[PDB]
Amino acid sequence: GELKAIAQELKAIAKELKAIAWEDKAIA
Amino acid sequence: GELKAIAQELKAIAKELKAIAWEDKAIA
Amino acid sequence: GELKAIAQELKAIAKELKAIAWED
Amino acid sequence: GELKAIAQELKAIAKELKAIAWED
Ligand SMILES: [N+]
Ligand SMILES: [N+]
Ligand SMILES: [N+]
Ligand SMILES: [N+]
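^ thats the input. predicted complex w/ ammonium ion below
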């Protein structure tokens, strides 16, 4: 369903934001 | 950090959307 | 950059949630 | 209702992400 699929997208965005945050630390 | 905290918020929103989607099914 | 593109995705999702709120 | 309030949260988060993109 649409809400289930939007929930999966939000969880994926959360993992993508943590990856960015981690890249950013490494480099600084 | 701020991105880590926003990631947690997005994961929490995903669980809240699935709960809404489930409530909605039960009732329909 | 990337964060702006993610922000745009979140805005698009917001619009989708408002639409779901008002369907039958 | 609730979904609208979540949509508003997502928009607020979008603004926070754009701000992070432009800090040092
Ligand atoms: N994404
Ligand atoms: N929330
Ligand atoms: N979406
Ligand atoms: N936030």
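Helices of chain C lie at 2-22.
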